[PDB]
Design a protein around this ligand. Structure first.
Ligand SMILES: *[C@@H]1O[C@H](CO)[C@@H](O[C@@H]2O[C@H](CO)[C@@H](O[C@@H]3O[C@H](CO[C@H]4O[C@H](CO[C@H]5O[C@H](CO)[C@@H](O)[C@H](O)[C@@H]5O)[C@@H](O)[C@H](O[C@H]5O[C@H](CO)[C@@H](O)[C@H](O)[C@@H]5O)[C@@H]4O)[C@@H](O)[C@H](O[C@H]4O[C@H](CO)[C@@H](O)[C@H](O)[C@@H]4O)[C@@H]3O)[C@H](O)[C@H]2NC(C)=O)[C@H](O)[C@H]1NC(C)=O
Ligand SMILES: *[C@@H]1O[C@H](CO)[C@@H](O[C@@H]2O[C@H](CO)[C@@H](O[C@@H]3O[C@H](CO[C@H]4O[C@H](CO[C@H]5O[C@H](CO)[C@@H](O)[C@H](O)[C@@H]5O)[C@@H](O)[C@H](O[C@H]5O[C@H](CO)[C@@H](O)[C@H](O)[C@@H]5O)[C@@H]4O)[C@@H](O)[C@H](O)[C@@H]3O)[C@H](O)[C@H]2NC(C)=O)[C@H](O)[C@H]1NC(C)=O
Ligand SMILES: *[C@@H]1O[C@H](CO)[C@@H](O[C@@H]2O[C@H](CO)[C@@H](O[C@@H]3O[C@H](CO[C@H]4O[C@H](CO[C@H]5O[C@H](CO)[C@@H](O)[C@H](O)[C@@H]5O)[C@@H](O)[C@H](O[C@H]5O[C@H](CO)[C@@H](O)[C@H](O)[C@@H]5O)[C@@H]4O)[C@@H](O)[C@H](O)[C@@H]3O)[C@H](O)[C@H]2NC(C)=O)[C@H](O)[C@H]1NC(C)=O
Ligand SMILES: *[C@@H]1O[C@H](CO)[C@@H](O[C@@H]2O[C@H](CO)[C@@H](O[C@@H]3O[C@H](CO[C@H]4O[C@H](CO[C@H]5O[C@H](CO)[C@@H](O)[C@H](O)[C@@H]5O)[C@@H](O)[C@H](O[C@H]5O[C@H](CO)[C@@H](O)[C@H](O)[C@@H]5O)[C@@H]4O)[C@@H](O)[C@H](O)[C@@H]3O)[C@H](O)[C@H]2NC(C)=O)[C@H](O)[C@H]1NC(C)=O
Ligand SMILES: *[C@@H]1O[C@H](CO)[C@@H](O[C@@H]2O[C@H](CO)[C@@H](O)[C@H](O)[C@H]2NC(C)=O)[C@H](O)[C@H]1NC(C)=O
Ligand SMILES: *[C@@H]1O[C@H](CO)[C@@H](O[C@@H]2O[C@H](CO)[C@@H](O)[C@H](O)[C@H]2NC(C)=O)[C@H](O)[C@H]1NC(C)=O
Ligand SMILES: CC(=O)N[C@H]1[C@H]([C@H](O)[C@H](O)CO)OC(C(=O)O)=C[C@@H]1O
Ligand SMILES: CC(=O)N[C@H]1[C@H]([C@H](O)[C@H](O)CO)OC(C(=O)O)=C[C@@H]1O
Ligand SMILES: CC(=O)N[C@H]1[C@H]([C@H](O)[C@H](O)CO)OC(C(=O)O)=C[C@@H]1O
Ligand SMILES: CC(=O)N[C@H]1[C@H]([C@H](O)[C@H](O)CO)OC(C(=O)O)=C[C@@H]1O
Ligand SMILES: *[C@@H]1O[C@H](CO)[C@@H](O)[C@H](O)[C@H]1NC(C)=O
Ligand SMILES: *[C@@H]1O[C@H](CO)[C@@H](O)[C@H](O)[C@H]1NC(C)=O
Ligand SMILES: *[C@@H]1O[C@H](CO)[C@@H](O)[C@H](O)[C@H]1NC(C)=O
Ligand SMILES: [Ca+2]
Ligand SMILES: [Ca+2]
Ligand SMILES: [Ca+2]
Ligand SMILES: [Ca+2]
Ligand SMILES: [Ca+2]
Lengths: 389, 389, 389, 389
């Protein structure tokens, strides 16, 4: 075992293959499955695992009532074997709280959870299954983090955190960890105006985090991190192809250095992109308004070119079905000469879009890149809401 | 650990002993057991596992309604400890999709699943739990494979795949893998006219696959594969003892080189045979029309002699009970000087034969050869359908 | 890691301490617990496990109806971590059948199950999780075995099997296994007239099997096996303290070399004793008529003296509660200079004694010896039958 | 791989961070969660586990009725992965009985359980999952122990046990174990007048046990143990800050050498403190009367100063929610230069305080020390009792 070094380039991606799907809500209609949200995946030398924030109740349990709520003392980050659904029986509690990230450095797994009241939240940083560091709120307003995996290089795992308003300028920091100890803290710099819920990946010595501007932009901010120097820059995705939700129609040109505003009725969703010159892919909901559908668009030079448009697309979830959050991960320990992009889509069921039930939960689908031109279909959740009425 | 080499001959078999039985439908009437079909078993150096395609719901769940359907985005290949019933709590997702095969090469397990729409399916080939290779449909019509284990020799594991019509000429290939990477692809050669759902085993450096002709024949095709030269031949089982379902009455003579037509109402079922001169055994349903009952027939020189008939019989599932698919496997890592034939029978319950429930599922029974003359009884599923009404 | 040898003496036993209790019926009133009967424990270098014959249904399932029946195609030998209750999720299928034994030889575990119809049963013998040997019925009448552990010495594990009538002379054999292979078969010799369901333990290079005479005797047969010579002798417990059920009142004098007849209404139950001169303990039901209560009696020289009576007692299960089978096991790999006796009691619930339910199952309690003088209370099952109405 | 030495000092503690919370009652409203009480945590070189006394029934089970009662033959000590809720499927049975302690010595875990009738209980001492020693009641009145973890130094693990009246002078002993074997027994000496339910931890070669005086004191006794000499002293916490329940108002001065009496209506609850001069923290229920609320109080020199009062506080459970037992543990195998204090609070639900249900159970929250000044919120159980009506 050795520390992961981000030595390899991204693999070429022409289409996406199915990696995993847990069918959590179909199964959970009858079996004992935990209510969750904010899922992701993360890998290590042995394979990949699913992660999510439990609501500390099962789906069919009476306590599922009220699980639209984001923050409670009953939430925790749980992990489990990829492809299984998350039950009380097969889930590892990583940390306690209602906002998380996790990553493996090649040696051990770091997991971070925030908990506490809005004005006095704190992070606990775990490494190798033991708590190492605690970080108090610096701005007194929902200290929070990625809700997908962090990335490590030579033992240094940067993590993007935000504390402050959802709907105004906030205080974002990049905290560089090693073995769960703080090596450096940086205040966000550059042109991104608001940062939440960063989806990060590493390639060729560089970490890129594609985030959520909940204040203004329907274009996604991008943080570019040098994990050796422990420095960063920020701006927006250049491309006119807008990938937040809600968003206005894609304009004639994007903006690399400022938010493109508009869209109704919601100010943002967690998402991701892989950015590698011609080899660039943007995910987004198919609906511009609602967390409905999910598509992958190949947008050459999305990172640098304001005129860049899609050259190919793959529907991941049809627009007659609910999506949710999406995020990046990579199996950095695959037996490949390149790092192959993967992503997941959270498939949210229940409130608020389906209000015939009292709960809010999700299932997971994940896909990874192929160089081939693979056929596709819709990987929607596949539960019948009427069965839960 | 080392690559398996198929150096041993097949064991002499005079009767069949019980290996495993999961009683899935009985247990699943109350416990949380996944709906499945297309089960099989496959072994490795440590022992044997059960496999099946989940339908992504439990048997008592409301989502079991409509599980007669073969292909959905909710299906996956799952494995579990031999003899347990498949629950959401004890099952490993091998890959996602609605047609599979799996085999261990002595080092690691290869698993393959096809998924996607009819006109644009793809396979993902996994090795040691990681995705290695993707394979797009070549004929745009339900790319599909064995539904039982593949077989490896010196790290080379041939797999039979078909893409094309169920009811007409299709495009079958033999794809030879090593550590999940394609070493060679062959188009089907020889006199078999249609190939599905091959049941394969190895002995003395030869792999023999006994398949389903869904187009014409009630006699089963046989593909003989040389995993070193990576070449093959094909024809039909010679014996007059016809083993597909539906089938006509056994004729006075079989046909080694052309399908024997007839039988109603169903064009085919997955089955198997062990072919070893005098030591040859043919499985089939007892009913010539329906997937009812299951019998083993010792048919010396079935592979070569059109006049060959049964010299002994063992009833596996009586003809008052439902059967289903059957397939071959061997514990190639047993401490014996010969490789001992094993087989399973899928015991399908529910639709279409039992239309008083809304679901279709199965349990498994598996048996292996004995040189002794063992007594026998019926290993039917054993659930009472009235309890599910 | 080596083959176990049985050279150590039995520990002094003055009282019995609680080892385990699984509370399976209390738990299974709501949780998914398998219906069982014929439990036991067996140990290995790592610890001890519980074992039993599943009925291939949960306790609360509709298929629990009719589980009074002893033999079906849906039974199997299952093992689980000591103390847990047996669910579909935590149980290992050892072999398939309706009569079993199991033991560890210090290297691997041998498990044997008989299955099939009454007139044509067979045993399959497993070693290290793989089938090794098959044994066809020799008398055409319910080939059957111990229902508690076997014992091994220097690789050789004798097992006592019976084939033949329950109510008349039968054909008992002692089969001596090594690595699941037959080393020697012996016909029952000596003065025991009928042998079933031997409870066996080793000490001082000698295996003693205390059995059930279902034909005539209310005294228990004792077979004494020499595992190095692979020879045996048989007779009856000499003591006047009669330990089968049903049995008459204890007479003035026992009978070492013939069955003492009498008792009503049942011809026998599986039981056990530890026979070590002054250090001898007999178990039995407290009721002479029914499988009610369970007591341990210290009966010095029970093996040799027809006049021997109890000098001390410990009630294990009060006579207001149901018992069942009882059997011997020892943790031969304990860090002691002597082998400490242990036993279990099967706590049978449901039919025929509790006929307000449709099922029959059991829970387990197990105790081992202490040289101390420990207090005691009843370890009855603890479920309320009313809750199952 | 080596015996734990208590060489390190305690860590500085300024606030408490969340370590784990199992949300057992919330989950157990629907999932198969065992009824427990008397929980704790204990760690080992790999991690930390949760522990509790099962009542041998699930929470939704009909046998949950009557689980207010403390002692039965259906209780056992169970352990499970920290953070999961205790189910029949994920729990290890450590020993059988109705009072326990457990600790790891660096090599293996010792677990002790008392069982039996009030007048004739006995302890069984387990090491590495095997029973080692038995200890009969010495005073014929509910032989009992800590209900939280013991502590080990150079292989020696002292354990505090009591036998005798709950409401009068009793017979307490300190038993010093190594590999589950009694090294030495001491009668309690010093000024503590009654001892129950000690909560113990180690630092700098000293073990301190902060206990429950059920007879007189609302101040807590403190036993100080040298595990090398295997000797002890006893007295009372000096501080005026009284930490038993029920208790009177804190007086002007505490008493180091005698109980401070009063309070209504209950004579005691298990609790804990960490005592390290200025770095001293006392836990107690917020209510002086009932097991309601939980607060940590930083009380410099609480061990030595009868005038010491609180300089900091942290509310762990608000006084609108039920608490219960509380106890100490440390992850002695953390990668830190100091031993970091941790504690748990048992969150009791059901009887007697919530009499609309028939049961009594609990969930667990656990927290460890931080040198930072972390914000806090209430970590109450979170279940809605109405859902169980
Ligand atoms: C302990 O259990 C064991 C384990 O099962 C059992 O041992 C078996 O014993 C029986 C004899 O009792 C053996 O049966 C022999 O089987 C031979 C082959 O039979 C198969 O093939 C027959 C021909 O089929 C072809 O042709 C016909 C047209 O003729 C056509 O319909 C077919 O489709 C096919 O083309 C077939 O007739 C036969 O059918 C029987 O079995 C099936 C199940 O497979 C059942 O569904 C049928 O209803 C029917 O029962 C079967 O499919 C056969 O050649 C042989 O016949 C000779 O011996 C008998 C005497 O036994 C003579 O009476 C007869 O004239 C022949 O000379 C016989 O039927 C079987 O092989 C043993 N199995 C093993 C593994 O050893 C023990 O009996 C059990 N003990 C107890 C006490 O129960
Ligand atoms: C087997 O499976 C293969 C895998 O899916 C499949 O291969 C696909 O083949 C199709 C058909 O040839 C190719 O389609 C091509 O895609 C590109 C790019 O399409 C995307 O972008 C355009 C432009 O969007 C922007 O501009 C418009 C208007 O100014 C705005 O509305 C928009 O927001 C952007 O600003 C967009 O119009 C496309 O819309 C389609 O798809 C979306 C979902 O992604 C739908 O919601 C929508 O209604 C519409 O159908 C799209 O988002 C396009 O420019 C080319 O002209 C061409 O259409 C796929 O790229 C290709 N995919 C891959 C991975 O190869 C095979 O077809 C399939 N075989 C069979 C037999 O089914
Ligand atoms: C703290 O715990 C200690 C251990 O748990 C416990 O110690 C026990 O103490 C008692 C004395 O108080 C000792 O009892 C002694 O027992 C022996 C043997 O008794 C057994 O056998 C006799 C004879 O049985 C035979 O003959 C009769 C008459 O013809 C027949 O009916 C029978 O079928 C046999 O042929 C028998 O009468 C006894 O019967 C009693 O026990 C049974 C259960 O086994 C009940 O069903 C029955 O109704 C009756 O109660 C018995 O079976 C006896 O000979 C001595 O005179 C004396 O009675 C225990 O041996 C001893 N045990 C151990 C393990 O040390 C302490 O009592 C306890 N302290 C408490 C509770 O305060
Ligand atoms: C982010 O969260 C932080 C962590 O919780 C928090 O930091 C806390 O801030 C508060 C407010 O500044 C601090 O309070 C200070 O506490 C000390 C200690 O007070 C405790 O003890 C006193 C005295 O108790 C004795 O005397 C009285 C008689 O006078 C008796 O009743 C009693 O039985 C004793 O003999 C006590 O009065 C305090 O009472 C408070 O707290 C309890 C719960 O513990 C409540 O039940 C009660 O109603 C009342 O609220 C207390 O028990 C005190 O002397 C100072 O004067 C000051 O009160 C916390 O210490 C501090 N905590 C930490 C860990 O740093 C931040 O406030 C928070 N930020 C925001 C924005 O919320
Ligand atoms: C339990 O099993 C018995 C045996 O199968 C069932 O009894 C049968 O029930 C049907 C329908 O009521 C009757 O017409 C038959 O006459 C009964 N058969 C026998 C052999 O008695 C019984 O119904 C089952 N009980 C439950 C609740 O499932
Ligand atoms: C809860 O358990 C109590 C105690 O066993 C039950 O109360 C008994 O119920 C039986 C049957 O109705 C009565 O005959 C007894 O007299 C009652 N005893 C006591 C001590 O009250 C009660 O029925 C159980 N409740 C539920 C819902 O199971
Ligand atoms: C820590 C926290 O509450 N995160 C929540 C996040 C947050 O409200 C937004 O990012 C504004 O800050 O939004 C959402 C959401 O579904 O949109 C769910 C998260 O649980
Ligand atoms: C991939 C797929 O759909 N396979 C299905 C297979 C197929 O329809 C036939 O082999 C014609 O191609 O048939 C059956 C069947 O019960 O007969 C079930 C399989 O799920
Ligand atoms: C293999 C088998 O049927 N064993 C059964 C055994 C047997 O009937 C008796 O030993 C006479 O042979 O008896 C009993 C019983 O509860 O008494 C249960 C066993 O399941
Ligand atoms: C072994 C035993 O019964 N312990 C019990 C203990 C005891 O009654 C008290 O310490 C006086 O001895 O009290 C309590 C309690 O909630 O107060 C619960 C424990 O189960
Ligand atoms: C089963 O599915 C059909 C097809 O969707 C549906 O209309 C019907 O109501 C379902 N039945 C049940 C009982 O859910
Ligand atoms: C029996 O086992 C013991 C302990 O392993 C060993 O030392 C002794 O040599 C063995 N004796 C025989 C004769 O095998
Ligand atoms: C622990 O104690 C042992 C035995 O006295 C001592 O030799 C050793 O140095 C100690 N090791 C650690 C690392 O605490
Ligand atoms: Ca936005
Ligand atoms: Ca056919
Ligand atoms: Ca008898
Ligand atoms: Ca359940
Ligand atoms: Ca007190």
């Amino acid at each position: 075992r050795t520390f992961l070094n981000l030595t390899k380039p991204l693999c070429e991606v022409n289409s996406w293959h199915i990696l995993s799907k847990d069918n959590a809500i179909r199964i959970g209609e009858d079996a004992h499955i935990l209510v969750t949200r904010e899922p992701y995946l993360s890998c290590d030398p042995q394979g990949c695992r699913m992660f999510a924030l439990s609501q500390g109740t099962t789906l069919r349990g009476r306590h599922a009532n009220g699980t639209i709520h984001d923050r409670s003392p009953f939430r925790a980050l749980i992990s489990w074997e990829m492809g299984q659904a998350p039950s009380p029986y097969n889930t590892r509690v990583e940390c306690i709280g209602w906002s998380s990230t996790s990553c493996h450095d090649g040696m051990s797994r770091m997991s971070i959870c925030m908990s506490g009241p809005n004005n006095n939240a704190s992070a606990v940083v775990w490494y190798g299954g033991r708590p190492i560091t605690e970080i108090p709120s610096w701005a007194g307003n929902i200290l929070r983090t990625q809700e997908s995996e962090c990335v490590c290089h030579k033992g240094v795992c940067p993590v993007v955190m935000t504390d402050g308003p959802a709907n105004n300028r906030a205080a974002t920091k990049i905290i560089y960890f090693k073995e769960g100890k703080i090596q450096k803290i940086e205040e966000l710099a550059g042109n991104a105006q608001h940062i939440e819920e960063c989806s990060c990946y590493g390639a060729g010595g560089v970490i890129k985090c594609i985030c959520r501007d909940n204040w203004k932009g329907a274009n996604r901010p991008v943080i570019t991190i040098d994990p050796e120097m422990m420095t960063h820059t920020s701006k927006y995705l250049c491309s006119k192809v807008l990938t937040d939700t809600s968003r206005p129609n894609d304009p004639t040109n994007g903006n690399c250095d400022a938010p493109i505003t508009g869209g109704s009725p919601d100010p943002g969703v967690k998402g991701f992109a892989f950015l590698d010159g011609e080899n660039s892919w943007l995910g987004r909901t198919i609906s511009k308004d609602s967390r409905s559908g999910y598509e992958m668009l190949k947008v050459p030079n999305a990172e640098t070119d304001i005129q860049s448009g899609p050259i190919s697309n793959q529907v991941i979830v049809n627009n007659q079905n609910w999506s949710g959050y999406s995020g990046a991960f990579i199996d950095y320990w695959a037996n490949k000469e390149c790092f192959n992009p993967c992503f997941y889509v959270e498939l949210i069921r229940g409130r608020p879009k389906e209000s015939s039930v009292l709960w809010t939960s999700n299932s997971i689908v994940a896909l990874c890149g192929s160089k081939k031109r693979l056929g596709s279909w819709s990987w929607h959740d596949g539960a019948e809401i009427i069965y839960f009425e």
